[PDB]
Amino acid sequence: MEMEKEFEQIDKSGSWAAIYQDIRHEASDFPSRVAKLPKNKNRNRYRDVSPFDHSRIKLHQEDNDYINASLIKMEEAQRSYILTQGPLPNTVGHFWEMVWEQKSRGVVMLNRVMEKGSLKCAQYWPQKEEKEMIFEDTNLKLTLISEDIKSYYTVRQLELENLTTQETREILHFHYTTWPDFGVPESPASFLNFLFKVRESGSLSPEHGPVVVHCSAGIGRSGTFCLADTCLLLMDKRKDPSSVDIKKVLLEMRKFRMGLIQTADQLRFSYLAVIEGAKFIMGD
Numbered sequence: 001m002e003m004e005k006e007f008e009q010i011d012k013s014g015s016w017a018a019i020y021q022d023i024r025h026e027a028s029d030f031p032s033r034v035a036k037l038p039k040n041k042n043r044n045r046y047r048d049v050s051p052f053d054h055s056r057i058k059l060h061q062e063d064n065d066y067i068n069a070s071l072i073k074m075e076e077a078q079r080s081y082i083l084t085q086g087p088l089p090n091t092v093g094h095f096w097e098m099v100w101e102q103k104s105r106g107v108v109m110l111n112r113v114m115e116k117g118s119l120k121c122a123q124y125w126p127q128k129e130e131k132e133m134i135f136e137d138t139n140l141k142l143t144l145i146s147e148d149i150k151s152y153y154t155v156r157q158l159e160l161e162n163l164t165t166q167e168t169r170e171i172l173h174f175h176y177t178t179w180p181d182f183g184v185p186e187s188p189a190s191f192l193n194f195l196f197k198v199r200e201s202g203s204l205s206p207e208h209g210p211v212v213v214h215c216s217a218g219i220g221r222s223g224t225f226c227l228a229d230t231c232l233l234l235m236d237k238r239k240d241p242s243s244v245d246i247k248k249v250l251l252e253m254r255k256f257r258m259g260l261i262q263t264a265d266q267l268r269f270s271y272l273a274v275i276e277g278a279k280f281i282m283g284d
């Protein structure tokens with residue numbers, strides 16, 4: 001069923017809450033035993049958001065290999081993403097270690113450091129060229145190279161140096177700065193424009209490690225980003241662009257990380273983004 005018609009049907013009936021609860025009911029449930037070990041309590045921002053053991057990213061150290069991050073691998077679409085929480089004061093070094101070890105080219109950030117008057121994640125990147133950051137626990141150095149501030153997003157060029165080997169890489173920071181404190185954007189135009197900027201960079205392409213994507217918990221706004229990307233990619237690959245069932249794509253993604261899409265408004269916004277984005281993907 002063409003999703004644009006499914007969309008108008010759900011909207012006229014006002015059954016977004018009912019669709020959403022059906023997804024919650026059918027979603028996968030797998031063990032998260034490593035996340036719940038007492039030694040990892042200060043490595044988790046939220047007590048009810050944990051990576052599944054089967055799909056968690058492991059840090060390459062013998063000490064403690066744990067980070068709140070999951071590898072989402074979409075077989076048909078041929079895309080991988082790592083979804084993670086906003087770094088904590090004691091996990092900033094783990095975060096950049098993961099970026100290094102997984103060979104990521106891009107970091108996508110969908111929240112502000114402060115929202116609703118509270119801290120949603122650590123200030124984990126340098127704000128001035130001449131004031132670089134050093135992560136002593138993981139032996140990395142991070143330098144701001146350049147900054148391009150636009151109305152809806154900011155792109156930063158960063159240099160990440162493995163102090164152990166003195167290799168350096170360029171990381172692109174894509175920061176979406178205008179998601180509202182409550183609800184979802186009224187139009188997806190600016191979100192879609194942001195997605196196409198990340199795509200244009202090469203950060204989502206198979207010659208790099210997976211893109212690292214985060215918000216505060218790494219399930220809501222982060223979920224919306226990778227669901228929309230994957231759905232538009234499938235609508236270009238397959239011979240019938242109307243085979244693409246957004247609910248089935250979401251349940252496939254929820255086999256890799258719990259809670260992707262946090263509200264019935266985020267589910268509706270995801271539909272709107274895919275429907276509006278398709279009017280480029282089909283030749284315009």
Ligand SMILES: Oc1noc2ccccc12
Nearest residue numbers: 237238239240241242243
């Ligand atoms: O309709 C379709 N064309 O190509 C496909 C591949 C997978 C699933 C559905 C379809």
